[PDB]
Design a binder for this molecule. Structure first.
Ligand SMILES: CCC(=O)SCCNC(=O)CCNC(=O)[C@H](O)C(C)(C)COP(=O)(O)OP(=O)(O)OC[C@H]1O[C@@H](n2cnc3c(N)ncnc32)[C@H](O)[C@@H]1OP(=O)(O)O
Ligand SMILES: [Zn+2]
Ligand SMILES: [Zn+2]
Ligand SMILES: [Zn+2]
Ligand SMILES: [Zn+2]
Length: 554
């Protein structure tokens, strides 16, 4: 429908093209079509297969060859990427090109918006991290060269040439090095567009938050809606409409009561939902099993319930998932040493909560509420491993904002201490100790007496210890505990004689089958496979919207 008259486009866009022209000397290399031979560069057309330059663009613009403005934008970016492709990162033309692109970014955005568009930005997704089958946690860097096979087996340029000979082994089968692709990790997927069904304008799907399941009749831009005074049909796939639980309700009431007491300007309501609950078992690993299970001194496995929960806030009218946590709950039927214990598997956040100055407070309220809740059920003890994610890894949310800092261990330890200190002052937590002091207090003598949690530090270090010492589970146990003690919190919810005569633990909430949220892996995998990043407010809002559709539909 919306037809851009060629003069309309010329008038609107030509100022953006002049802005590039007016850059001396940066513009000069780009003002005329590259003559490879004159410019003393023969292989140019071996690399650059779709040449483009300012003059060619000016001409297409003057002569009405563009039907819509994104075609102009695409050519501009083709010109830039041609130059970034052919020239070295350190070269003259490269840096000139970079300067032009910055001028362009700033020029083009408000013009595109004048023309009825979401924005005028060129948007691409973050590059995925490439691992290496050659070693355990080797990784391949952005833009550096690497070797791959079937887009499945990749090797860093170092660890690839390490292997003696010309044959690699995958799995087991043998592949000649000549069968690998040599390539640079410089591939970035563009954001997708959706077309207004009325005016025909292409908008970024993430800018307008159009999801085909939620609005199956099709996308209609805000411009077209307002002209006829319409509004979008309600999004029924919201956080609030996910099923309630006793736990979710308890947590969200605690949070919102806290926010109401603070009475900070521009506060929003928080929604907390438990989205997974299932029964699982942790099995004792082979070292510890040989040492204590086979002689009947320790159970071969421990049953627990895992739960996943998330908190959401409305930001700019749209749901935003900002906090996530998975827990392991070992009930009263579980064998010692795990009986009546909870452990936090992992928690994660995306720093867009409003107001900022209450963000940490709100995270604390969620954790204190959770401790209070399980205490009420008759869990006696909480367990926290203060362990920051490894570099550029995510616990729950794929692709954090690059300006969201990740705490080192001392800051994270202090953060948990501040939370627990508030919990103590509220008489929820009786007291808490590091693992070394707690063991001392419990007069612990053997490794079989340490709580054994899925994924936790201690089951792994005990394997290592037994093997290193050639058979002892407990020789350097106190020394290992002392050494790592600042990192391991033991939290006493129910103290002393009362902890010995408790009734059975009965959870009033039902099981909640959701494979997507059975541990952290599935949602990370989904997010990676569907470009659901939490790296900006707009992408997190999109990703939350997609997450909520998945939770509602599956
Ligand atoms: C088994 C694993 C576990 O369950 S424990 C591991 C928990 N999970 C993680 O560490 C995942 C990554 N972290 C997060 O999502 C958040 O850091 C969590 C833990 C939720 C807490 O966030 P928040 O309440 O904002 O505290 P915070 O310390 O992150 O930030 C508050 C202020 O400190 C700053 N900060 C953070 N890191 C650094 C740093 N490395 N160097 C310098 N400053 C840092 C932040 O920028 C922030 O500053 P400000 O308050 O905005 O002024
Ligand atoms: Zn846009
Ligand atoms: Zn490697
Ligand atoms: Zn429209
Ligand atoms: Zn404030």
């Amino acid at each position: 429908k919306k037809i851009f008259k060629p003069e309309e486009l010329r008038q609107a866009l030509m100022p953006t093209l002049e802005a590039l022209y007016r850059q001396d000397p940066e513009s000069l290399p780009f003002r005329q079509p590259v003559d490879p031979q004159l410019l003393g560069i023969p292989d140019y057309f071996d690399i650059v297969k779709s040449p483009m330059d300012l003059s060619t663009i000016k001409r297409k613009l003057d002569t009405g060859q563009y039907q819509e403005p994104w075609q102009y934008v695409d050519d501009i970016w083709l010109m830039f990427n041609n130059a970034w492709l052919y020239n070295r990162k350190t070269s003259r033309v490269y840096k000139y090109c970079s300067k032009l692109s910055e001028v362009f970014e700033q020029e083009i955005d408000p013009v595109m918006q004048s023309l009825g568009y979401c924005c005028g930005r060129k948007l691409e997704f973050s590059p995925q991290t490439l691992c290496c089958y050659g070693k355990q946690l080797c990784t391949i860097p952005r833009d550096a060269t690497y070797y791959s096979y079937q887009n499945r087996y990749h090797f860093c340029e170092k660890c690839f040439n390490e292997i003696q000979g010309e044959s690699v082994s995958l799995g087991q089968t043998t592949i000649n090095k000549e069968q690998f692709s040599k390539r640079k990790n410089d591939t970035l997927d563009p954001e997708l567009f959706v077309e207004c069904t009325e005016c025909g304008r292409k908008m970024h799907q993430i800018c307008v938050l159009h999801h085909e399941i939620i609005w199956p009749a099709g996308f209609v831009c805000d411009g077209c809606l307002k002209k006829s005074a319409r509004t979008r049909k309600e999004n029924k796939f919201s956080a609030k409409r996910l099923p309630s639980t006793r736990l979710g309700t308890f947590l969200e009431n605690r949070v919102n009561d806290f926010l109401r007491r603070q009475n900070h300007p521009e506060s929003g309501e928080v929604t907390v939902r438990v989205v997974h609950a299932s029964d699982k078992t942790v099995e004792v690993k082979p070292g510890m099993k040989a040492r204590f299970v086979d002689s009947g001194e320790m159970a071969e496995s421990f049953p627990y319930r895992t739960k996943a929960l998330f908190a959401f806030e409305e930001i700019d009218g749209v749901d935003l998932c900002f906090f996530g946590m998975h827990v392991q709950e070992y009930g009263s039927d579980c064998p010692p040493p795990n009986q009546r214990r909870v452990y936090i598997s992992y928690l994660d956040s995306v720093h867009f909560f409003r107001p900022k100055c209450l963000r940490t407070a709100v995270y604390h309220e969620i954790l204190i509420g959770y401790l209070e809740y399980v205490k009420k059920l008759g869990y006696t003890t909480g367990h926290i491993w203060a362990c920051p994610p490894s570099e550029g890894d995510d616990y729950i949310f794929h692709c954090h904002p690059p300006d969201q800092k990740i705490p080192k261990p001392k800051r994270l330890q202090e953060w948990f201490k501040k939370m627990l200190d508030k919990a103590v002052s509220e008489r929820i937590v009786h007291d808490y100790k590091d693992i070394f002091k707690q063991a001392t207090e419990d007069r612990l003598t053997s490794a079989k007496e340490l709580p054994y949690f899925e994924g936790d530090f201690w089951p792994n270090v005990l394997e290592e210890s037994i093997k290193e010492s050639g058979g002892s589970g407990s020789q350097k146990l106190y020394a290992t505990m002392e050494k790592h003690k600042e990192v391991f919190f033991v939290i006493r919810l129910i103290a002393g004689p009362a902890a010995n005569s408790l009734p059975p633990i009965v959870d009033p909430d039902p099981l909640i089958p959701c494979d997507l949220m059975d541990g952290r892996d599935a949602f990370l995998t989904l997010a990676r496979d569907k470009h659901l990043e939490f790296s900006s407010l707009r992408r997190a809002q999109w990703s939350t919207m997609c997450m909520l559709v998945e939770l509602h539909t599956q």
